[PDB]
From a paper:
VRC01-class broadly neutralizing HIV-1 antibodies have been isolated from several people living with HIV-1 infected by different HIV-1 viruses and bind a well-defined epitope within the CD4-binding site (CD4-BS) (1–6). Antibodies in this class are all derived from the pairing of VH1-2*02 heavy chains (HCs) with a limited number of light chains (LCs) expressing rare five-amino acid (5-aa) CDRL3s. Contrary to most other anti-CD4-BS antibodies, they recognize the CD4-BS primarily through their gene-encoded CDRH2 domains, although their CDRH3s also contribute to this interaction. Here, we employed a prime-boost immunization schema in the VRC01glHC mouse model that led to the isolation of a VRC01-like antibody whose κ8–30*01 LC had acquired a CDRL1 indel.
To better understand why 8–24 neutralizes the autologous tier 2 426c.WT virus when expressed in 293S/GnTI- cells but not when expressed in 293T cells, we carried out structural analysis using cryo-EM. Due to the weak binding of 8–24 to 426c.WT.SOSIP, we were unable to generate a complex of 8–24 antigen-binding fragment (Fab) bound to 426c.WT.SOSIP. We screened numerous variants of the 426c.TM.SOSIP by cryo-EM, where 426c.WITO.TM.SOSIP produced the most homogenous particles and highest resolution reconstruction. In the complex, the SOSIP is in the closed, prefusion conformation. Overall, the main contacts made by glVRC01 that are gl-encoded were maintained in mAb 8–24: Thr28, Thr30, Trp47, Trp50, Gly55, Gly56, Asp58, Tyr59, Gln61, Lys62, Gln64, Val67, Thr68, Met69, Arg71, Thr73, and Ser74 in the HC; and Tyr32, Gly68, Gln89, Gln90, Tyr91, and Glu96 in the LC (following Kabat numbering). Notably, there are many mutations in the framework regions. While these do not directly interact with the SOSIP, framework region mutations have been shown to increase the breadth and potency of neutralization in HIV-1 antibodies. Moreover, the long CDRL1 of 8–24 appears to come into proximity to the C-terminal end of gp120 α-helix 2, potentially creating an interaction that is lacking in VRC01-class antibodies with a short CDRL1. This long CDRL1 reaches toward the N276 glycan and, along with the CDRH3, appears to create a channel that could accommodate the shorter glycans at the N276 site, suggesting that the interaction between the long CDRL1 and the α-helix 2 may be possible if the glycans expressed on N276 are short, as is in the case of Envs produced in 293S/GnTI- cells.
Residue numbers in the entry:
A (entry chain D): 2 to 52, 52A, 53 to 82, 82A, 82B, 82C, 83 to 100, 100A, ...
B (entry chain E): 3 to 27, 27A, 27B, 27C, 28 to 91, 96 to 107
C (entry chain B): 33 to 57, 65 to 137, 148 to 310, 313 to 393, 408 to 503, 519 to 548, 569 to 662
D (entry chain A): 569 to 662
E (entry chain A): 186 to 237
F (entry chain A): 83 to 134
């Protein structure tokens, strides 16, 4: 089970940026996939999960109306998209998965982490 | 909000240390749990403690977790060189202030 | 002194996995070629002085029947005609003769009865199942959605999906328990418990964001979750005042049969009159009352937050909107009109959309094509409960919100099965006694061992044969129960206690096993509690008894050797 | 296509036989064929000439009227067995 | 037109199957046996109407 | 075979279960035996015919 991401990103203010998360090694449709953004010198914060089973999602009110999550069962890959960029966005992002379905709140497997920046 | 204080400490190798994670949920209801996650700068964080005191597989037992209800503690019997890193506690979506350890 | 003594038929049980079986009441799927006639009445029995616990979430019945529904569905669909050849170019235009992108008209070459005879043929489709052939020229070009993914099947026209109120019955040696308390969270202790043999007729209904029909909670509004703290875990809320609702397809439709192959006929859609997208009606005036009541109930669990509802967060069509079936026609109604911080005092109507190719469950191998149904159609029903999912971020404003969700078909059945629970029986009890050798099924469990011992024969006789893709199940059940019963009988025989129920023996009781007040044991204790510690020394006891029998027999023969 | 049939047949026959054996056992008449018991005959069931019954009648004809009171008889026999067993244990309680 | 044109009867109705050449239909004198606990009875009278 | 004198009985050959029982049995054995053989589907093609 490995978690991979796409290369870093740079974009102008006011645009929208997309990033990918490729997963392998187990049933891609059995575990919530979580997203966490870390700015330099800041604590890990939750952005939202997506359940691969049927594309359900969730988001905190902080990011609501700004995020979009989608899945491709063909390539078992998650896509995140953030709109109306602004410096705060600039940070690293990690897609993670939980050890057990029942708890669905741990994080054993982490992608290498991908950085994005504005301008 | 879950609180991890202090933010750091002028540690020295070979000492028993313990840091406190204090929750703020104290509401509704098994029973609430905690997760001590490790992370060195520049790499993926790592899982150290899950549940409340069941440490992760392969972790030196000197790393330990304890507590209940609202007061919990990451603990180390004797801090080694590689152990100097950052750590956080996580009960739910929220995360603590973390802590990093170093020398003068 | 005291003496080991056996009793056969003691009323004790233990939870464990099993396999219940269907029970039904002239062409429907489940009743036909399956299911035995239902018991006219429940032989329900009340068990006072009996406390228990339940875990509706971690349950086997729900999951058990899940794949059962799946399998019956698939098997019923097995013999119908495969629509394989239809995956052909689709030269299409705009519908109507008197742009309405809700449906597109199309025409295409295709195969007659004869291989080398090819004919053109037209048909109307909802824009959903159609797709552009490619990102290429010939905008008229299109293909069915599934073809680049997999094939589908035209359901046999005769079969229907009217959910029958199926019952479930357990096999002998097993009992089904109901927590009578009408305010049980679904995971926890229960005090008022009854026992029945077959589950009440439950309809195998499917829906998202809604619980059509089902049942109310007569007491009040009910809320239950595995853990409402964990935002991810689903929440289910059951209403105590069913809310009427209706939906309809205001169109006059009819099917054109096309012999695609030699004996295989597709059923293309066609319309008579104009085209008006389906819709619904609901008395929002009714809606607001239940909304406010459930909001107060939520506040009870969240004394420092507000309460609201928004549309589905977004995702797959079925999850996003409310999907359901109406007389075998799949409907998807945009539910933004409901989950809002504001409604009207007037009736509320909803715009829905209709699909003809259906992925009944995420795996695509079972892709189905819904045949069109002649003439307009309309279904009236009611709401009893609904599934909610919390946002998961503590707003400083404390504006706590929930959104519709679902998609986990198990939860639908859980919504009702939470009441039931299944256990087995281990009728072999052991106790000390001074002796030395030489109906209301299971009701007596409400008393102590010495007193309850009177009616053991009822449990003994009942537990055997009271019963009288599919066969395998019941055959396994019967064979396994029979094997268990034979095992127990043989164990009784080896102990030389065959043909008896309060058989005394010749092994004195051992202090180490326990030293309780025998008076309490026979008058203050109950088997369910008695067995707990005795469990430890069971094998030692069995060995001692077997040796006793062996030595008795051998000595008898020796003294009678001549 | 084939196995299912004979498997059903064998299982059902075995179940029936076990049911009958168990019914014999509860009546405490296991390991017997002319088991006498401790429930006196009731006149209401019938009052035929016992001589005819044992020397003039045949079972196919005997059973016809007896069918009526079968369940009452079964209950009486079961109670007889239960009371016999419980009383035995009581007198041997010590 | 094309009176030479013809088709198999079933095609406009349904398909059919070519029986495996090896199999044959010689009716074997099958016997039927009842399961235990059941008995098979024969009316010896050779002039029985069949109902009576 | 066993003879049972002093035994009278009755029969209803018409309303009987054995006949019906074996009916579908024959049908099923027939169909199953025909199951593995080759389907003649493709033959449903134009037939340009003449006199034999
Ligand atoms: C059920 O029915 C309800 C009732 O209408 C639906 O709710 C409405 O949904 C629509 C669609 O989202 C929504 O319209 C959007 O409102 C947003 C509020 O700010 C707008 O930001 C958004 O703008 C985009 O769409 C417009 C029209 O499609 C475009 O004109 C606009 O330029 C935006 O699209 C372009 O620009 C963005 C900018 O980044 C770009 O990313 C895009 O790719 C594109 O280039 C829409 O105006 C309504 O506001 C909703 N109604 C209410 C009352 O809120 C609901 O969607 C239905 N759901 C289902 C499942 O049926
Ligand atoms: C929740 O409960 C409500 C309340 O019952 C459910 O709503 C009912 O749903 C049933 C089933 O869809 C529906 O039954 C129809 O009622 C019509 C009213 O007159 C009948 O005319 C109609 O008869 C036709 O369909 C039957 C289906 O088998 C046939 O048996 C019957 O012979 C008729 O058949 C015609 O159509 C078929 C179609 O192929 C054709 O082959 C025949 O030749 C013939 O032309 C149904 O009996 C009720 O009307 C609904 N009642 C209300 C108030 O809505 C609701 O469905 C439940 N919840 C869910 C999710 O389903
Ligand atoms: C059978 O055919 C269907 C046809 O839909 C295939 O599904 C489509 O597959 C294509 C390519 O595989 C997908 O293309 C992607 O579309 C994005 C935008 O369109 C989608 O999103 C809008 C949003 O409203 C929808 O309206 C629209 O219908 C599409 O769903 C593009 O932006 C994508 O490119 C971007 O993302 C990639 C990866 O993140 C980046 O690398 C790119 O640089 C770019 O930023 C992409 O091109 C399309 O989305 C699919 N649609 C659907 C509905 O699934 C099936 O895959 C196919 N299956 C088989 C087995 O044949
Ligand atoms: C597969 O193909 C077969 C081809 O035979 C079809 O069967 C024929 O279907 C046609 C039309 O469906 C039938 O046409 C009728 O024929 C009558 C006279 O011919 C029949 O009777 C003579 C008597 O000797 C036969 O020799 C001859 O083979 C035919 O069987 C016409 O007089 C009929 O019209 C009259 O009756 C109707 C209704 O009562 C009236 O309304 C008319 O006004 C008129 O008085 C009619 O045209 C033909 O009989 C069928 N033949 C057979 C053998 O079945 C199958 O239907 C087809 N099936 C599929 C699934 O494709
Ligand atoms: C769902 O509910 C909606 C309404 O909530 C309903 O559609 C409405 O139906 C009524 C009919 O009961 C329509 O009322 C019309 O009002 C106009 C005045 O603006 C009248 O002129 C109309 O008169 C015609 O219809 C009468 C009906 O008896 C005739 O008697 C008369 O001679 C005329 O032919 C009519 O009364 C109303 O307009 C519609 N709504 C809309 C938006 O058009 C719908 O039928 C319900 N459907 C279901 C399945 O419950
Ligand atoms: C305990 O549960 C039982 C059964 O669930 C309840 O008994 C029913 O009570 C209603 C109301 O009087 C009657 O209409 C039913 O006929 C009763 N059924 C049976 C089987 O007893 C009982 O009322 C409940 N009691 C408490 C205190 O909860
Ligand atoms: C029915 O079950 C509910 C819970 O499902 C019981 O509620 C308890 O009520 C007592 C008395 O007020 C409280 O002390 C407990 O804290 C409650 N527990 C819960 C989980 O709500 C209720 O007592 C039960 N009553 C009956 C008659 O069954
Ligand atoms: C459904 O359950 C709710 C649960 O509250 C009931 O609301 C209570 O109703 C009683 C009497 O009707 C009032 O005394 C309470 O104050 C109400 N509770 C609240 C929080 O307001 C409601 O009446 C029930 N209705 C039905 C039809 O079952
Ligand atoms: C909610 O819908 C129901 C269902 O139509 C309405 O029920 C009516 O209630 C009144 C009040 O006594 C009765 O007189 C009617 O006979 C009921 N009709 C039916 C069909 O049940 C109820 O009025 C609606 N509530 C609101 C607030 O509109
Ligand atoms: C359930 O338990 C209660 C007490 O545990 C039993 O109460 C007995 O009731 C009878 C009838 O009046 C009294 O003579 C007894 O003295 C009561 N018991 C005690 C300990 O005082 C009740 O009988 C039990 N019911 C069942 C069906 O077992
Ligand atoms: C009654 O039926 C039995 C059997 O169907 C007849 O017995 C057979 O009689 C023939 C002729 O003598 C013998 O060859 C057979 O060996 C006998 N078989 C058996 C089993 O008995 C008998 O003859 C018939 N009698 C009458 C009066 O009908
Ligand atoms: C065999 O069966 C036939 C009828 O199947 C019997 O025929 C009866 O013969 C008596 C004597 O003549 C008549 O009184 C009846 O009217 C006849 N009944 C019928 C239905 O034909 C015959 O008696 C039987 N005989 C034997 C030896 O079995
Ligand atoms: C539906 C379809 O296949 N139509 C085609 C048509 O476009 C084409 O012009 C003709 C001759 O090539 O054959 C046919
Ligand atoms: C529907 O169409 C059929 C056939 O076109 C016609 O007989 C019937 O009267 C129509 N009824 C309605 C309500 O459209
Ligand atoms: C609920 O909303 C009201 C106004 O709509 C507001 O005054 C109140 O503070 C809110 N409750 C919470 C817990 O924030
Ligand atoms: C609905 O009517 C009630 C009175 O029955 C009123 O208090 C409420 O404000 C009304 N709301 C709307 C949205 O019409
Ligand atoms: C469906 O059509 C029939 C006549 O074809 C008509 O009587 C009936 O009212 C229609 N159904 C609805 C819901 O309008
Ligand atoms: C049985 O009785 C003996 C008698 O002393 C005692 O030592 C022993 O602990 C008892 N229990 C077992 C399991 O042997
Ligand atoms: C013996 O019984 C006690 C309490 O009944 C239990 O804790 C213990 O596990 C038992 N020993 C064994 C070996 O099961
Ligand atoms: C049994 O004997 C009693 C004795 O009087 C009699 O009243 C009764 O009718 C008999 N039969 C039954 C079925 O009780
Ligand atoms: C009792 O027996 C008579 C004759 O044997 C019969 O007519 C009657 O139906 C029987 N009663 C019942 C309840 O079966």
């Amino acid at each position: 089970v490995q978690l991979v991401q796409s290369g870093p990103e740079v974009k102008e203010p006011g645009a929208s940026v997309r990033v990918s998360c490729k997963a392998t090694g187990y049933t891609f449709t059995d575990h919530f996939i979580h997203w966490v953004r870390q700015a330099p010198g800041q604590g890990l914060d939750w952005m939202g999960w997506i359940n691969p089973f049927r594309g359900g999602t969730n988001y905190p009110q902080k990011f609501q109306g700004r995020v979009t999550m989608t899945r491709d069962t063909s390539f078992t890959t998650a896509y995140m998209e953030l709109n109306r960029l602004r410096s705060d966005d600039t940070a690293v992002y990690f897609c993670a998965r939980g050890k057990n379905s029942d708890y669905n709140w741990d994080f054993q497997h982490w992608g290498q982490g991908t950085l994005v920046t504005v301008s | 909000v879950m609180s991890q204080s202090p933010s750091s400490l002028a540690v020295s190798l070979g000492e028993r240390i313990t840091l406190s994670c204090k929750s703020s949920l104290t509401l509704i209801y098994g029973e609430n749990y905690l997760a001590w996650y490790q992370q060195k700068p520049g790499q993926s964080p790592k899982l150290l403690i899950y549940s409340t005191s069941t440490r992760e597989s392969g972790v030196p037992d000197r790393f330990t977790g304890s507590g209940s209800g609202t007061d919990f503690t990451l603990t180390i019997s004797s801090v080694k060189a590689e152990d100097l890193a950052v750590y956080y506690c996580q009960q739910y979506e929220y995360f603590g202030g973390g802590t990093k350890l170093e020398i003068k | 002194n005291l003496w080991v003594t056996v009793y056969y038929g003691v009323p004790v049980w233990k939870e464990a996995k099993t396999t219940l079986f269907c029970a039904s009441d002239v062409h429907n799927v489940w009743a036909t070629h399956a299911c035995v006639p239902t018991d006219p009445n429940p032989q329900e029995v009340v068990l006072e002085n009996v406390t228990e616990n339940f875990n509706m979430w971690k349950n086997d019945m729900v999951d058990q029947m899940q794949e059962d529904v799946i399998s019956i569905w698939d098997q019923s669909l097995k013999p119908c005609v495969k629509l394989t050849p239809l995956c052909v170019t689709l030269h299409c235009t705009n519908v109507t003769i008197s742009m309405r992108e809700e449906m597109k008209n199309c025409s295409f070459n295709t195969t007659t009865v004869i291989r080398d005879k090819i004919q053109k043929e037209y048909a109307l489709f909802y824009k959903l199942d159609i797709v552009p052939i490619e990102g290429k020229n010939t905008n008229t070009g299109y293909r069915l959605i599934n073809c680049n993914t997999s094939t589908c099947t035209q359901a046999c026209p005769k079969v229907t999906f009217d959910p029958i109120p199926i019952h479930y019955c357990a096999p002998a040696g097993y009992a089904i328990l109901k927590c009578n308390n009408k305010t049980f969270n679904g995971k926890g202790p229960c005090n008022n418990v009854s026992t029945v043999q077959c589950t009440h007729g439950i309809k195998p209904v499917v829906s998202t964001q809604l619980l059509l029909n089902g049942s109310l909670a007569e007491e009040e509004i009910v809320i239950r979750s595995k853990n409402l703290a964990d935002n991810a875990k689903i929440i289910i809320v059951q209403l105590n005042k069913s809310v009427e609702i209706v939906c309809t397809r205001p169109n006059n439709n009819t099917r054109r049969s096309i012999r695609i192959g030699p004996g295989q006929t597709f059923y293309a859609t066609d319309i008579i009159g104009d085209i008006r997208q389906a819709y619904c009606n609901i008395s929002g005036r009714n809606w607001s009352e239940a909304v406010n009541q459930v909001k107060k109930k939520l506040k009870e669990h969240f004394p420092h937050k507000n309460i609201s509802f928004q549309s589905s967060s977004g995702g797959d069509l079925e999850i996003t909107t409310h999907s359901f079936n109406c007389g075998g026609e799949f409907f998807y109604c945009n539910t933004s009109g409901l989950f809002n911080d504001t409604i009207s005092n007037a009736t509320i109507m909803l715009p829905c959309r209709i699909k003809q190719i259906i992925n009944m469950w995420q795996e695509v191998g079972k892709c189905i094509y819904a045949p069109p149904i002649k003439g307009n159609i309309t279904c009236k029903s009611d709401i009893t409960g609904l599934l909610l999912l919390r946002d998961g971020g503590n707003t400083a404003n404390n504006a706590e919100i929930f959104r519709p969700g679902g998609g986990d078909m198990r939860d639908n059945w859980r919504s009702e099965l939470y009441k039931y629970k299944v256990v087995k029986i281990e009728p072999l009890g052991v106790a000390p006694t001074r002796c030395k050798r030489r109906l209301v099924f299971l009701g007596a469990a409400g008393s102590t061992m010495g007193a309850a011992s009177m009616t053991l024969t009822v449990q003994a006789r009942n537990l055997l044969s009271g019963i009288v893709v599919w066969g395998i199940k019941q055959l396994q059940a019967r064979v396994l129960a029979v094997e268990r019963y034979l095992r127990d009988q043989q164990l009784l025989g080896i102990w030389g206690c065959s043909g008896k129920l309060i058989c005394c023996t010749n092994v004195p009781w051992n202090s180490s096993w326990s030293n309780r007040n025998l008076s309490e044991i026979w008058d203050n204790m109950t088997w369910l509690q008695w067995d707990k510690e005795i469990s430890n020394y069971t094998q030692i006891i069995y060995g001692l008894l077997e040796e006793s029998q062996n030595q008795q027999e051998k000595n008898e023969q020796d003294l009678l050797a001549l």
